[PDB]
């Protein structure tokens, strides 16, 4: 599913991302924009055989299991396919685990380079939240 900006903002708010770990809602919307362009089915293959999945491009060697890299971690305890669902629950729950381990949103380089320090509130402007 390709979410609309405000549609995604509303879904993320319903799932408790607004101000989660000190990050206002716009941070999450901006991160999703630059990671997946709001497409839940976004995937990207890496040189080590791992794959990044979903709206927040979560990596399979650490956060989820896709069985393609035996011995890898599955810190979010979920099949990577769950991160491609039109229902963003799995992506949100995993993002919460990632952002709360001590590195904040810097875990998403795209967020650090394209969102950090900007007027992130602009991403939820004009939205019915």
């Amino acid at each position, epitope marked *: 599913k390709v979410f609309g900006r405000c549609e995604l903002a509303a879904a993320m708010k319903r799932h408790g991302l607004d101000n989660y770990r000190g990050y206002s809602l716009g941070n999450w919307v901006c991160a999703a924009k630059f990671e997946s362009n709001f497409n839940t089915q976004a995937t*990207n293959r890496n*040189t*080590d055989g*791992s794959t990044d999945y979903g709206i927040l491009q979560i*990596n399979s*060697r650490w956060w989820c299991n896709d069985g393609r890299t035996p011995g890898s971690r599955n810190l979010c305890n979920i099949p990577c396919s769950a991160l491609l669902s039109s229902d963003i629950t799995a992506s949100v729950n995993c993002a919460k685990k990632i952002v709360s*381990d001590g*590195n904040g949103m810097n875990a998403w*380089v795209a967020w650090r380079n394209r969102c950090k320090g900007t007027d992130v509130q602009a991403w939820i402007r004009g939205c019915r939240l």
Partner: nanobody
Amino acid sequence: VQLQASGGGSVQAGGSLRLSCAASGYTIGPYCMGWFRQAPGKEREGVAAINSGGGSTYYADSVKGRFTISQDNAKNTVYLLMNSLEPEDTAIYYCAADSTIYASYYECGHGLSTGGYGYDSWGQGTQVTVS
């Protein structure tokens, strides 16, 4: 974390040396383990890096073909085999690590040419001298 390394020393040009490094204080990471070096009076520079997850390796052009970085991710250790050493390789070598568990795939080689950006942990430095 706390990085401790061993090995190195003095050797004649054309010789070989093998550096070892162990990280202590991690529970999940590190995400990256690498080697940097600093010649007398110069700024520190990257040498090689490796992704703890996956084992992808990265090297500075100055050492490609002569140096090989390897690891034991289960024990949070990293190694640097240095063959065909030359006088210009003389410097203080540093073991380094990036503790951030990135969400999306992150190439550990990025910090090699960006002044060690991302590498938050550093060893004390081990001398390597090539005559």
